[PDB]
Amino acid sequence: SDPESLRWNVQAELVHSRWAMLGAAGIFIPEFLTKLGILNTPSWYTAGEQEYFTDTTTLFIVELVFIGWAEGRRWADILNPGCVNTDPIFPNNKLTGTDVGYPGGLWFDPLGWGSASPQKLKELRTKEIKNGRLAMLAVMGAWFQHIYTGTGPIDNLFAAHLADPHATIFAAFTPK
């Protein structure tokens, strides 16, 4: 008859989805773009030629210092200031709420018409393919399985085996 489920912060999950899959937009075409044999072959002897490696897990700091700065300072001030204490405007804070941010403060505001509104027209682009990313990297992020799993010979683990026709990997297409 139906679940009392809609989170109220059901509003948050979705701008958490603009995260996961717009971000995963920068994966589908850089990966499956490849360039097969551009001319041919990658040769990467450069910042990794001969200086005792380069990254790996000093990669993580240099990667996620300013991604720490990027992601960190994102949802914190997407909009919300005011931020204090006592009573509810319902999500699980909304202490900004009725207050935009500052009474008579500065230029807290982006743009005219007493709001944060970047006008009403732009439902066209970011509704379809951009949240399509959600429903695309859903099964095309679940091509993950098909692309590698089956562990190209080398490794069978707790040998049950249980079947044998032929291998499985990735390249595009398929037998049949």
Partner: peptide, 29 residues
């Protein structure tokens, strides 16, 4: 990894391969 020549000299090859008589199956029978 680390590469020296040339992802190959002669590219990937005889690992699917069938070609002149792609036969087995369509054929056998």
């Amino acid at each position: 990894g680390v590469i020296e020549e040339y992802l190959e000299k002669s590219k990937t090859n005889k690992e699917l391969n069938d070609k002149k008589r792609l036969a087995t199956t369509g054929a056998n029978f």
